[PDB]
Design a protein around this ligand. Sequence first.
Ligand SMILES: CC(C)(C)NC(=O)[C@@H]1C[C@@H]2CCCC[C@@H]2CN1C[C@@H](O)[C@H](Cc1ccccc1)NC(=O)[C@H](CC(N)=O)NC(=O)c1ccc2ccccc2n1
Lengths: 99, 99
Amino acid sequence: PQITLWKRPLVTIRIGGQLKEALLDTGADDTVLEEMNLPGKWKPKMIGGIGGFIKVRQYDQIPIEICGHKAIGTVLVGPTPTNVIGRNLLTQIGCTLNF
Amino acid sequence: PQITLWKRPLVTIRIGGQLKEALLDTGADDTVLEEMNLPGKWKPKMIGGIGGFIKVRQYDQIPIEICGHKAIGTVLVGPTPTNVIGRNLLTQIGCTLNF
Ligand SMILES: CC(C)(C)NC(=O)[C@@H]1C[C@@H]2CCCC[C@@H]2CN1C[C@@H](O)[C@H](Cc1ccccc1)NC(=O)[C@H](CC(N)=O)NC(=O)c1ccc2ccccc2n1
């Protein structure tokens, strides 16, 4: 589908048996999700952005469905005010920017 | 043009009569550029990102050429890791997400 940018590009995602709203973010290298108790091993990581860095937990090979499109990859979990779908997953669902 | 996301979506912009590189970011509501001198008066403002809030200078009605396309809107200048072109300007050039 085609998504206009008049409003934040929020879509429904499915991860770890849960439905959430997430922001399609072409400006994010990674996918960062709100704090959630996912099972499995994780490794500590530090990621940054505008106001500085935050500590997050890195989970690998997590199945995730974005707007009905299946994907699988690395997700970072931490204290973020919003769920962000970064380029690592956007490329998997064939997402492109057009103008 | 159609831009894939395997690499960061960086484009060249011309502003204040000078060239710079910026990121086309669908996740950003506003446009934030690295510290630089811009004609006109500015107003102190604060914006939040991942990591926290920062103090920026707000310049209104600034003309900016993005990859050959003209736009005129609000631009925020402050201590940012990279130049980000947000939705306020992306909408002006007719940018959309597609998959
Ligand atoms: C620019 C501003 C208007 C303030 N908006 C935002 O920052 C909003 C805020 C929203 C609410 C909080 C959670 C994030 C979302 C999306 N972001 C947009 C969002 O696109 C933002 C843009 C950006 C890119 C690079 C540097 C700074 C800022 N990206 C990010 O925050 C992603 C997060 C990540 N690790 O994937 N950062 C990076 O992709 C990234 C890349 C290289 C870097 C080098 C040095 C330091 C930091 C670096 N961060």
